[model samples]
Target chain A: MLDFRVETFLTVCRTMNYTRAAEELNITQPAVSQHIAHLERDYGVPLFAYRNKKLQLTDAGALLRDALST
Target chain B: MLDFRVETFLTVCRTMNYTRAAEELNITQPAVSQHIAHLERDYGVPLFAYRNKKLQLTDAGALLRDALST
Candidate 1:
């Protein structure tokens, strides 16, 4: 079984939309946000930057995604 | 965050006793057993074998432990 948070993170990265990611993951949007928030807090780095209501991965987030992709 | 089941499995492996593992993991013995059962079912292999009322790791279990140790 995968870490649910990491799985959620990857899904969010793929969709770039919290609502879509939540739907794909079968979790509430608030739960998705909690996962992302916990990850960011634990790692002390921002994973995504919000721009005009769009989510974009930060450099650290992209690096993390690449590392975890495999 | 780690998959709770995997962490529970590791704790059980280290302790080699479900009751102790439950105490260490702060979960019920039945819950630990369920995690192990789910893992065994998912992998279609027995990770532990009983010997004289004691839990012992099967070959597959040892291999998995070694792989996950790192």
Candidate 2:
């Protein structure tokens, strides 16, 4: 067992929308942000950032996404 | 990142006592047991079993212990 945030990462990745991911996972929006914040802190890199007012994964975040693609 | 039961497992393995581990981890004994239960349910096998009313790791638990020993 590793982390409890990976699923949230994946869900947030899939939906690319915190509110949607929160709804999909039955978690609150702030908790969804909290999950991503946990991962970001662990990895010491921000996972996603707004690009053109839309969300986009950062380089490190994309690497994590690819690694966990399964 | 994966399941969140690992830290509890490692701590419990080291302490070999729920109360001790809970104390070490700053978690309640029931929460410690809950963590182990998560791993047990995920692995579909018991990680620990009572022996003479004492705790002992199962084969699977030992494997996990060795696997994470670094």
Candidate 3:
């Protein structure tokens, strides 16, 4: 239903930091967050699980990212 | 080497406006333009040709966009 959002999400997943991902993408931090939020809402899944202020991908995020890379 | 730029280019090709494509992608118009510029530079091809202040995809852009859709 959407396009290139998967790429943005994948970038955020790889960096695990919205600021860093935004810099890499040449986009603003807010834009990056919005992209992640939109994707998470769309999929009904949390791409990143927060623990000790650190973020990691959930099983679904990992699987989806891997699939898109193929 | 890049990702999802093809999708952005395709969106722009469909809409023929950086503003509209950015709106659909939930990004800024400048971002859309930058995405298109980067892709054109990478491929050394003009994705859109200016004709009477209107734009249309060249053969290369059309083929590349079609390939990405698959």
Candidate 4:
């Protein structure tokens, strides 16, 4: 079972839109960010980031997604 | 990187001693229990337990240990 925060991160990964993820999770966008913040803080690297306004997962982020999703 | 609570869980698994885990983590017995409690709540299964005053991991607990350690 994934942690709630991890679930939030995964939701954002699938949607690639915080607003959409928030709406899907029935949570606020800020809450979505805060959840990812904690995961990045623990992971010691940014999990999700926007490059030129396009959201993408970092290598570390993808690794985590792979590990946990498996 | 593992979640903080997962670290605590692993420490307890290695030591098989909550107090030892607490000492290693520089926390209290109650604190250790609290961490495991949160994990159990999220995992929907007990990870650690004592029977006849001996500590051991449940099947789910060992599965998680294998998953995370690899």
Candidate with top DockQ is 4
Candidate 2 regions exceeding 4 Å error are A1-3, B1-70
lDDT of 1 by residue, A22-50 (tens): 98988899999999888777655677888
Better of 3 and 4 by DockQ: 4
Residue range B1-70, candidate 2, lDDT tens digits? 2445777888998988899999998889999999888767754557789999989987556545644542
Write candidate 4's Cα lDDT for B1-70 as tens digits: 3478878988998998999999999999999999988877754567778999999887556555644654
Error of 1 at A51 (Å): 53
Candidate 1 lDDT, B1-70, residue by residue in tens? 1378778878988999999999998889999999989877765557788999878887556545644542
Superposed by TM-score, candidate 2 places the C-alpha of residue B25 at a distance from the truth, in angstroms, of: 40
TM-score order, best first, reads 4, 1, 2, 3
Q: lDDT by residue for model 3 over A6-42, one digit each (tens)? A: 6678788889887899999999989888887876675
Q: Spell out the clash pairs found in candidate 4.
A: none
C-alpha lDDT of residue A38 in model 3:
78
Interface DockQ of each model: 0.02, 0.02, 0.02, 0.03
Q: What i-RMS does each candidate reach, in Å? A: 15.3, 14.2, 14.7, 11.9
The per-model lDDT (C-alpha) reads: 0.75, 0.74, 0.70, 0.75
Which candidate, 1 or 4, has the higher TM-score?
Answer: 4
Candidate 4 or 2, higher lDDT: 4
Cα lDDT tens digits, model 3, B1-70, are 2556756877888898878899999999899888988866754556678888887776555545443553
